[PDB]
Structures are given as C-alpha cells and as structure tokens.
Amino acid sequence: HQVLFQGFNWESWKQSGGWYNMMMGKVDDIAAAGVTHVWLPPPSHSVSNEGYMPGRLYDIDASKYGNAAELKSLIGALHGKGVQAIADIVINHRCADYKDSRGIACIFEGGTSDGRLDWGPHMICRDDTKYSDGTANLDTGADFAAAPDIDHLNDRVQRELKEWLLWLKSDLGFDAWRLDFARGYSPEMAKVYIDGTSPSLAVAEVWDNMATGGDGKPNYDQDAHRQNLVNWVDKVGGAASAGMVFDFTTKGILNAAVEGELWRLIDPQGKAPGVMGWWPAKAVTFVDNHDTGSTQAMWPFPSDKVMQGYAYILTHPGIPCIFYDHFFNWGFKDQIAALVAIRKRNGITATSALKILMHEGDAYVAEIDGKVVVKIGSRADVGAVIPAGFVTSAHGNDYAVWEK
Ligand SMILES: OC[C@H]1O[C@@H](O)[C@H](O)[C@@H](O)[C@@H]1O
Ligand SMILES: [Ca+2]
Ligand SMILES: [Ca+2]
C-alpha cells in the first residue's frame, strides 16, 4: 500500500487562521481514508504568496501559510496517524532579498545570523544575464524568467542546500521531497540533492508539452512524452534512487480519453499509455494539481468526469496522489476512500499487474492482479467481459468496481 495526498491548492495561503491550523482538522479524515503521504507547500519565506518565489529559505515563519511552530504541530499530527510528510522543494531559482553594488537584486539572505545561503551573483548562472555577474557556471536546465536561476554546479550551493534540506527533516519533520520545476536542472543535479538527503521518496515535476493533433487534441502515441520521463528517472539512479516522477503522460492522455475516447488508454503493447505502463513504481499518477486545476486551471480535468479518474488511478498500477479540493470540497469524500480501501483491501500497489479487458471509446474495463476489475465510461452494459467470481462493489457516476 502507498498513496499520496496534495494537502493544499492555489488559494490555501489566504486561509483565515493559517493553512496548517485549519489542516490539523483534516488529519484523521486523511489518515483514516488510506493516505500514507502528504504533500505540503513551500514552507519558506517567498516573495510571492503561494511560495514558489522563495528567498529567505530558513525563514519559515514569514510564510503566508503558517510558521515553524505550526508546521511541526501539523507534521507531528500526521506522524501520529502514521502518515509521512513531504516538502515542496523549490531550488531551480530563488529571489535575492536585497540590492547589490549595481542596483540589480542579487544579494541573497539565507534567513539566519550567519551567511548561510547569503550568496551573491556568483551563485547565479552566468547565462541568466539579467542578474548574473558572468562568473558562475552555465544553467544546467531550463530558465525561469521571473527570477534568478541558481548555479547548481556551484560547490557552495550544493553544500548549503543539502544542509538546509537536511535541516527541514531534522527540525520540522519532513520525510520526502517534491521537486518543483525539475525541468530547470539536469537530473544529474537532482541526484546530488536526492542522495545527500535521502528522503523516503522524491517525486519531481518534469512537465514538457504533449504532442498534439492539428485539432488541439493530444496525439495517440505518447511514447516520446513518457520516454522523457522514464529517462529523467534513468539518469537519477533509477532502481536505486529515491526519486520518481509525476505521470504527466497519464494526465494528458486521460484528459482526452474520458471524453468518449477511452480507446486512448492502451498502447499497441496491451499496456497503459502513461509512465504507468513502462515504469509503474516511479510514476505518481494524479487527476489535477495546483497548476492544472484549482484556480490556475492551466490544464483542468473534465469536471463532470473527475471521479472516472480516481476510479482509474486509485486502482491501477502506479502511485496515486489525491487532490485536496477533490477530497473535501467536491462532494466525493466517501466515494474516494472507498476505493483506496479496495486498493488496500486487495493488497494492490505501484507494481500490481494490469490486464486491460476492454478499451473502446466509451468503455474501459480492466483487471488488476486478477483481484480487482474497474470500468469507467458511459456504456450501461459490459457484463459480457467481467471474469468469473466477480461480485460488484464500489461505483457511481459512470464507473463501477467488482472485487473477486
Ligand atoms: O510548473 C512548474 C512550476 O512553475 C512555477 O513557475 C509555478 O509558480 C509553480 O506553481 C509550478 O509548480
Ligand atoms: Ca544570514
Ligand atoms: Ca531566471
């Protein structure tokens, strides 16, 4: 068993009383439901609210989310119900607290009395001219316009950062990492960090565009899209690494399939289309996150089919991550934990076997480990293909479940 849970959305920082405090009230519900890991936002002080524009890294208190006290207060409740804690680690770029000799904002403040993380333009890639001094290394990954990109090839940086990371665990309680904007630095670099801080798991956010038909729809063969993920995992230690990646491949394909095109959920090999069917133990599947859904909606899921997804991800191979809004604010609390249970009751995991039984545009049926069968889609009958000794069980709005 192993299930993740993103414990926040875009709007979270606004939360009257502090996000963590209101969350203390969702601990048992999440735990009892079957979750095992929770993903909390960037705890650090951030120029921006949501925290993806970090500066004073050790400055936990400044957070719009809550402070050091409450974060622990909250991570400990989780640990009390046996759920691990993940920290949204944002290090591809960073904002300098103050102005240097030139007027350009490149003098950083770590957040403590010493000079830890009190870096200068020297820790800014020389190719991010808008801030650099031209003396650092070259960016090892994508750049982020909005702010100074840190030169991770920098001896000091990899040092003070692991120390900072190691502190997050040793002080607050964090267990695992969720690497923000991983497309910003070579996997070679994530590896430095992952290994010298060894989290129970490190899921990264590598998000490339999906190839699309002239008509806006995503193509059917997404092999290239997912080969770029199993590869990034490849270059990071793979089998022996704590790192894993969100199955963006699955999101794009699934986004288009619930729309009467379930046939898209199978590759010529009889396998799943996302990273799921290639490396199921290194693929974190999901329905929507704080970028793709919520109030940013860069790529939301068909709202009237959001359950067809959970019916899919919470029973298939791969690690499913449940989205906040979805569990507490959409009227699906119960429906969701019922599955996690199924997944749990039947000892299903990241690597269970998958046996697609039907992949027609309006009907997708499957058998996982020959203990569970799920069908999503708008087609009243499929009795025709449901192995022997399968009693019905969980179901609802265009999805059904039969356990042996
Ligand atoms: O998409 C990668 C990341 O890009 C950043 O610019 C956004 O602020 C984050 O919310 C997002 O996780
Ligand atoms: Ca300092
Ligand atoms: Ca930049």
Ligand SMILES: [Ca+2]
């Ligand atoms: Ca970068």
